[PDB]
């Protein structure tokens, strides 16, 4: 099945998911000079005060922290969004080295990792129906650079040795995703897709300009995870990022002058 290796990685995905060559694929390079400030964007609102994490899971491609999305608790609204989008999970993409790992790039610059907070449009009732819609999802993307430690990440790092291999999951309650956000909510936005199969074109991307800093030790712990399941040959979970895809007929808007 699909992955990030030579024989099943991004260059192969189109054979099983032809939308991989579609008109609104993600990620993209964000050319900051060609992005245009949009005064029509409303203030972005990230309201995570009532967020309720449930579990953390190694799915063979990344690890997901999943949330209870059965009520309006952790919502994203404003900015480019119409209505309310509810947080369902977050995960990261990262590299084998600090010089790569992000999916989006900024003037071709790659960050060491990228955090994706995944939300679904509440007008569609749940995530499964939302992924049948062109405005079903909103993903808030946050770049990670290696520097000072991010205290709010440490609870995630500390649990990773319990989910080393594909299929392992662990209870993960009371995690506050607000500890993963940078100071500024300045962002770029554009219409795109999931960055992993099935690559569905449902996403309003909101990519924050300001990276968060994590320590080398924190990202090294991400790199100890495994793509493989228990009892299979060990393949370190690294470089689980899709490269930038063609912008085609899209414009990137900036929330800031
Ligand atoms: N062999 C099959 O059956 C194919 C046929 C080919 C096709 O027609 O597609 N069909 C699917 O595979 C499929 C089709 C439609 C819906 C599906 N399930 C729900 C959508 O997938 C949810 C899992 N992913 C995420 O939630 C996610 C991914 C990336 C990001 S990110 N990095 O962008 O933030 C954020 C969230 C699936 C599926 O079973 O997967
Ligand atoms: Zn992602």
Swiss-Prot record:
Changing residue 64 to L: Reduced activity. The record marks 89 as: Involved in the binding of some activators, including histamine and L-histidine. Changing residue 62 to S: 2-fold decrease in enzyme efficiency, as determined by kcat/KM ratio, and efficiently inhibited by chlorzolamide. Changing residue 141 to R: In OPTB3; complete loss of activity. The modification Phosphoserine is found at residues 162, 169. The active site is at 61 (proton donor/acceptor). Changing residue 118 to A/G/I/L/S: Reduced CO(2) hydrase and p-nitrophenyl acetate esterase activities. Changing residue 61 to W: Impaired activity, rescued by 4-methylimidazole (4-MI). Impaired activity, not rescued by 4-methylimidazole (4-MI). Changing residue 61 to G: Impaired activity, not rescued by 4-methylimidazole (4-MI). The keyword Metal-binding applies. Changing residue 103 to D: Normal CO(2) hydrase activity. Its cofactor is Zn(2+); Co(2+). GO terms for molecular function: arylesterase activity; carbonate dehydratase activity; cyanamide hydratase activity; zinc ion binding. Changing residue 59 to D: Strongly reduced activity. Changing residue 118 to K/R: Strongly reduced CO(2) hydrase and p-nitrophenyl acetate esterase activities. Optimum pH is 6-8. Keywords: Acetylation, Cell membrane, Cytoplasm, Disease variant, Lyase, Membrane, Metal-binding, Osteopetrosis, Phosphoprotein, Zinc. Changing residue 91 to Y: In OPTB3; partial loss of activity. Changing residue 15 to E: In Jogjakarta. Belongs to the alpha-carbonic anhydrase family. Target of drugs used in treatments against glaucoma disorder and breast cancer. Interacts with SLC4A4. Interaction with SLC4A7 regulates SLC4A7 transporter activity. Interacts with SLC26A6 isoform 4 (via C-terminus cytoplasmic domain). This is Carbonic anhydrase 2. It comes from Homo sapiens. The lineage of its organism: Eukaryota, Metazoa, Chordata, Craniata, Vertebrata. The gene is CA2.
């Amino acid at each position: 099945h699909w992955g990030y290796g030579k024989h099943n990685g991004p260059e192969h995905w189109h054979k099983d998911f032809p939308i991989a060559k579609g008109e609104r694929q993600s990620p993209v390079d964000i050319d900051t000079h060609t992005a245009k400030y949009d005064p029509s964007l409303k203030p972005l609102s990230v309201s995570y005060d009532q967020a309720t994490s449930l579990r953390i899971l190694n799915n063979g491609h990344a690890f997901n922290v999943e949330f209870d999305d059965s009520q309006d608790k952790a919502v994203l609204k404003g900015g480019p969004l119409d209505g309310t989008y509810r947080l369902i999970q977050f995960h990261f993409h990262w590299g084998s080295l600090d010089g790569q790992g992000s999916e989006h790039t900024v003037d071709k610059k790659k960050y060491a990792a990228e955090l994706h907070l995944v939300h679904w449009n509440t007008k569609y009732g749940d995530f499964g129906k939302a992924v049948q819609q062109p405005d079903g999802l909103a993903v808030l993307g946050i770049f990670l650079k290696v520097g000072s430690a991010k205290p709010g990440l440490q609870k995630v790092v500390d649990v990773l040795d319990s989910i080393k291999t594909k299929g392992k999951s662990a209870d993960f309650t009371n995690f506050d995703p607000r500890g993963l956000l940078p100071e500024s909510l300045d962002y770029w936005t554009y219409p795109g897709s999931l960055t992993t199969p099935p690559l569905l074109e449902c996403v309003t991307w909101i990519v924050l300009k300001e990276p968060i800093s994590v320590s080398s030790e924190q990202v090294l712990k991400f790199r100890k995870l495994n793509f493989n399941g228990e009892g299979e040959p060990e393949e370190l979970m690294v470089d689980n990022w899709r490269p930038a895809q063609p912008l085609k007929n899209r414009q990137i808007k900036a929330s800031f002058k």
